[PDB]
Design an enzyme around this catalytic site. Structure first.
Site, PDB file in Angstrom:
ATOM      1  N   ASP A  59      -2.659   8.552   4.725  1.00  0.00           N
ATOM      2  CA  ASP A  59      -2.824   7.330   4.272  1.00  0.00           C
ATOM      3  C   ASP A  59      -4.322   7.635   3.609  1.00  0.00           C
ATOM      4  O   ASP A  59      -5.135   8.443   4.078  1.00  0.00           O
ATOM      5  CB  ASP A  59      -3.135   6.556   5.256  1.00  0.00           C
ATOM      6  CG  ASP A  59      -3.997   5.125   4.820  1.00  0.00           C
ATOM      7  OD1 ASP A  59      -4.000   4.965   3.570  1.00  0.00           O
ATOM      8  OD2 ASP A  59      -4.669   4.510   5.652  1.00  0.00           O
ATOM      9  N   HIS A 113       0.623  -1.378   0.206  1.00  0.00           N
ATOM     10  CA  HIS A 113      -0.078  -0.069  -0.043  1.00  0.00           C
ATOM     11  C   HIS A 113       0.849   1.324  -0.034  1.00  0.00           C
ATOM     12  O   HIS A 113       1.850   1.216   0.475  1.00  0.00           O
ATOM     13  CB  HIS A 113      -1.076   0.119   1.059  1.00  0.00           C
ATOM     14  CG  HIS A 113      -1.724   1.143   1.437  1.00  0.00           C
ATOM     15  ND1 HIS A 113      -2.333   1.888   0.492  1.00  0.00           N
ATOM     16  CD2 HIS A 113      -1.919   1.697   2.933  1.00  0.00           C
ATOM     17  CE1 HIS A 113      -3.088   2.762   1.173  1.00  0.00           C
ATOM     18  NE2 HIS A 113      -2.952   2.783   2.658  1.00  0.00           N
ATOM     19  N   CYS A 127      -4.222   3.972  -4.746  1.00  0.00           N
ATOM     20  CA  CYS A 127      -3.589   4.431  -3.492  1.00  0.00           C
ATOM     21  C   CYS A 127      -2.150   5.449  -3.690  1.00  0.00           C
ATOM     22  O   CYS A 127      -2.103   6.423  -2.942  1.00  0.00           O
ATOM     23  CB  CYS A 127      -3.343   3.308  -2.599  1.00  0.00           C
ATOM     24  SG  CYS A 127      -2.227   2.197  -3.537  1.00  0.00           S
TER      25      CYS A 127
HETATM   26  C1  3VK Z   1      -3.228   0.524  -3.242  1.00  0.00           C
HETATM   27  C2  3VK Z   1      -2.594  -0.201  -4.496  1.00  0.00           C
HETATM   28  N1  3VK Z   1      -1.359  -0.794  -4.275  1.00  0.00           N
HETATM   29  C3  3VK Z   1      -0.121  -0.302  -4.959  1.00  0.00           C
HETATM   30  O1  3VK Z   1      -0.219   0.523  -5.808  1.00  0.00           O
HETATM   31  C4  3VK Z   1       1.202  -0.465  -4.438  1.00  0.00           C
HETATM   32  N2  3VK Z   1       2.266  -0.801  -5.667  1.00  0.00           N
HETATM   33  C5  3VK Z   1       3.228  -1.509  -5.286  1.00  0.00           C
HETATM   34  O2  3VK Z   1       3.522  -2.210  -4.325  1.00  0.00           O
HETATM   35  C6  3VK Z   1       3.881  -1.806  -6.666  1.00  0.00           C
HETATM   36  N3  3VK Z   1       5.119  -2.144  -6.246  1.00  0.00           N
HETATM   37  C7  3VK Z   1       6.306  -1.692  -6.748  1.00  0.00           C
HETATM   38  O3  3VK Z   1       6.284  -0.483  -7.415  1.00  0.00           O
HETATM   39  C8  3VK Z   1       7.761  -2.466  -6.173  1.00  0.00           C
HETATM   40  N4  3VK Z   1       8.500  -2.317  -7.362  1.00  0.00           N
HETATM   41  C9  3VK Z   1       8.891  -3.295  -8.368  1.00  0.00           C
HETATM   42  C10 3VK Z   1      10.127  -3.371  -8.924  1.00  0.00           C
HETATM   43  C11 3VK Z   1       7.902  -1.600  -4.875  1.00  0.00           C
HETATM   44  C12 3VK Z   1       8.542  -0.493  -4.903  1.00  0.00           C
HETATM   45  C13 3VK Z   1       8.662   0.163  -3.834  1.00  0.00           C
HETATM   46 CL1  3VK Z   1       9.652   1.575  -4.014  1.00  0.00          CL
HETATM   47  C14 3VK Z   1       8.499  -0.527  -2.460  1.00  0.00           C
HETATM   48  C15 3VK Z   1       7.867  -1.839  -2.505  1.00  0.00           C
HETATM   49 CL2  3VK Z   1       7.602  -2.211  -0.966  1.00  0.00          CL
HETATM   50  C16 3VK Z   1       7.719  -2.335  -3.578  1.00  0.00           C
HETATM   51  C17 3VK Z   1       3.060  -2.648  -7.735  1.00  0.00           C
HETATM   52  C18 3VK Z   1       3.914  -2.861  -9.169  1.00  0.00           C
HETATM   53  C19 3VK Z   1       1.839  -2.284  -8.259  1.00  0.00           C
HETATM   54  C20 3VK Z   1       3.159  -4.136  -6.943  1.00  0.00           C
HETATM   55  C21 3VK Z   1      -2.886  -0.050  -1.770  1.00  0.00           C
HETATM   56  S1  3VK Z   1      -4.419  -0.645  -1.370  1.00  0.00           S
HETATM   57  C22 3VK Z   1      -4.808  -2.154  -2.589  1.00  0.00           C
HETATM   58  O4  3VK Z   1      -5.492   0.531  -1.763  1.00  0.00           O
HETATM   59  O5  3VK Z   1      -4.563  -1.322   0.037  1.00  0.00           O
END
Ligand code: 3VK
Lengths: 11, 204
Positions: free
Chosen positions: B71, B54, B122
């Site tokens: 958040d 997230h 998010c």
């Molecule tokens: C809202 C939807 N969730 C997200 O957008 C979270 N997105 C992600 O975790 C990213 N992951 C990444 O960008 C990872 N990098 C891949 C090379 C990553 C980057 C960084 Cl700086 C830190 C981390 Cl821990 C991971 C993806 C590609 C979409 C998974 C959250 S909700 C669903 O509303 O609870």
């Protein structure tokens, strides 16, 4: 926008 | 599903957070240790090695000595900890010691959701707050031109039918928002609005 709550922390 | 670090890093730069932006971090963003300058960041709730879960936004104002934690759902530290296995105590520790004289600091945060339960906008919301923060960092949460477009609603009301017509309406104006200000948004707009949709988490 959004309401919020400010909390004075110390360390 | 959601926005990736690059996506956010690019948009946050279209929104001008450039001079003030410290990058994108897993759950282990150090804090604001560098100097007492208007700084901000994006911190994932999870450690890099989960893939990432997230997005959160974090800001530092000099004048007020205030960490803003944002958040998009306004979950309390306690809820964020429970749902996302996330806490940022030693984060504020390092910070308030790094930067404040009396070693004290204010923590300001939402009690109010802008996101729909199911949405994955998010980061895009986190980006929107990081635009409001870097132009009005004294009043970032409400009563500035960027959040006046958005409508907070009591967190605790999240899983409720009454709210969603408003929670969708934030998510339209959040897209209007980014479209207006970000070249990268428009460029990727279709695949972005599809991967961060209101109902992605049941479109998985
Ligand atoms: C809202 C939807 N969730 C997200 O957008 C979270 N997105 C992600 O975790 C990213 N992951 C990444 O960008 C990872 N990098 C891949 C090379 C990553 C980057 C960084 Cl700086 C830190 C981390 Cl821990 C991971 C993806 C590609 C979409 C998974 C959250 S909700 C669903 O509303 O609870």
């Amino acid at each position: 926008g959004v309401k919020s709550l400010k909390r004075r922390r110390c360390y | 599903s959601g926005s990736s670090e690059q996506e956010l890093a690019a948009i946050v730069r279209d929104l001008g957070c450039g001079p003030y932006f410290l990058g994108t971090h897993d759950k282990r963003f150090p804090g604001f240790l560098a100097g007492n300058k208007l700084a901000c960041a994006i911190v994932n709730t999870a450690g890099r090695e989960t893939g990432g879960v997230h997005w959160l936004a974090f800001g530092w104002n000099p004048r007020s000595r205030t960490c803003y934690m944002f958040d998009p759902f306004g979950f309390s530290d306690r809820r964020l900890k429970q749902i996302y296995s996330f806490e940022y105590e030693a984060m504020l520790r390092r910070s308030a010691l790094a930067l404040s004289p009396d070693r004290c600091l204010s923590l300001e945060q939402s009690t109010q959701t802008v996101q729909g339960p199911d949405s994955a906008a998010c980061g895009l919301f986190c980006c929107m707050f990081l635009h409001a923060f870097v132009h009005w960092p004294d009043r970032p949460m409400d009563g500035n031109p960027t959040m006046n477009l958005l409508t907070g609603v009591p967190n605790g009301m999240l899983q409720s039918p009454q709210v969603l017509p408003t929670l969708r309406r934030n998510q339209e104006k959040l897209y209007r928002f980014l479209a207006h200000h970000s070249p990268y948004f428009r460029s990727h707009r279709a695949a972005i609005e599809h991967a961060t949709a209101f109902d992605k988490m049941k479109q998985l």
